[PDB]
Design a protein around this ligand. Structure first.
Ligand SMILES: [Ca+2]
Length: 279
């Protein structure tokens, strides 16, 4: 399959060169896999989700996405026009309020909930959790992320937007999960993106157009945008049988475009997420 005039980020994921405009992907498109988007919620009614999105859990007074962040990230995982894995099943867990924040206690609860909830869902090709959030270091938060991973969910987390070593952030610092930096359309490290030895992979993160609330769209930037590129890619490759939840992060690093990125500090991977599609 090919999507012409696709957002730059999706075209990059399936190309060895920057500057192309088509998203070449396999038509399975993540069918049979499920992705929990742990964030502000999802506007499940947006036409771009075609009914594949569902709010399963909220920790506030309502399950609606009043921010837009969760809807934008879910759109990059799985929307028809803006999404990596266009047929995957999306589940929303609202651990962040409509201002974008939430306590570690709630985030840990949401992560533990996904670990057990996945035993009530039909996800034959496997389960992915996308976490585009974080903050200062916490070993309780790291350890929740490690538990989520060890229960058989592919955990992808944002490295954070501080242009610093992500070793001082969580869950970004947890070694057993997949920590995602951000790049821009000219294969430069995005100027805000954290770096360091804990990073596993880079994905597109600057000027990412995706879905938004009110059935609209918009383009924003962050390692929060790079993370669902990688979470969607994992669900894409799990559906294909290329890798498992336990191994997907390491498979994506094995098969990445190597050395292409600019402005990468010594000690940090030069690896850009890539789907290796061959028509
Ligand atoms: Ca890691």
């Amino acid at each position: 399959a090919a999507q012409t005039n696709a957002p730059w980020g999706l075209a990059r994921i399936s190309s060895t060169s920057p500057g192309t405009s088509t998203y070449y992907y396999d038509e399975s498109a993540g069918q049979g896999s499920c992705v929990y988007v742990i964030d502000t919620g999802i506007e499940a009614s947006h036409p771009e989700f075609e009914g594949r999105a569902q709010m399963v859990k909220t920790y506030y007074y309502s399950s609606r996405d009043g921010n837009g962040h969760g809807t934008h990230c879910a759109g990059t995982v799985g929307s028809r026009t803006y999404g990596v894995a266009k047929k995957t099943q999306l589940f929303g867990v609202k651990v962040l309020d409509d201002n974008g924040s939430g306590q570690y206690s709630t985030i840990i609860a949401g992560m533990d909930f996904v670990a057990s909830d996945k035993n009530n869902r039909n996800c034959p090709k496997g389960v992915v959790a996308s976490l585009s959030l974080g903050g200062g270091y916490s070993s309780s938060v790291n350890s929740a992320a490690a538990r989520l991973q060890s229960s058989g969910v592919m955990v992808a987390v944002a490295a954070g937007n501080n242009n610093a070593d992500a070793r001082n952030y969580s869950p970004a610092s947890e070694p057993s999960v997949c920590t995602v930096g951000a790049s821009d359309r000219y294969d430069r490290r995005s100027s805000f993106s954290n770096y360091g030895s804990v990073l596993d992979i880079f994905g597109p993160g600057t000027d990412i157009l995706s879905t938004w609330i009110g059935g609209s769209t918009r383009s924003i930037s962050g390692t929060s945008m790079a993370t669902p590129h990688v979470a969607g890619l994992a669900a894409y490759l799990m559906t294909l049988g290329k890798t498992t939840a336990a191994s997907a992060c390491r498979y994506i690093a094995d098969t990445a475009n190597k050395g292409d990125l600019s402005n990468i500090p010594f000690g940090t991977v030069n690896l850009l997420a890539y789907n290796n599609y061959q028509a």
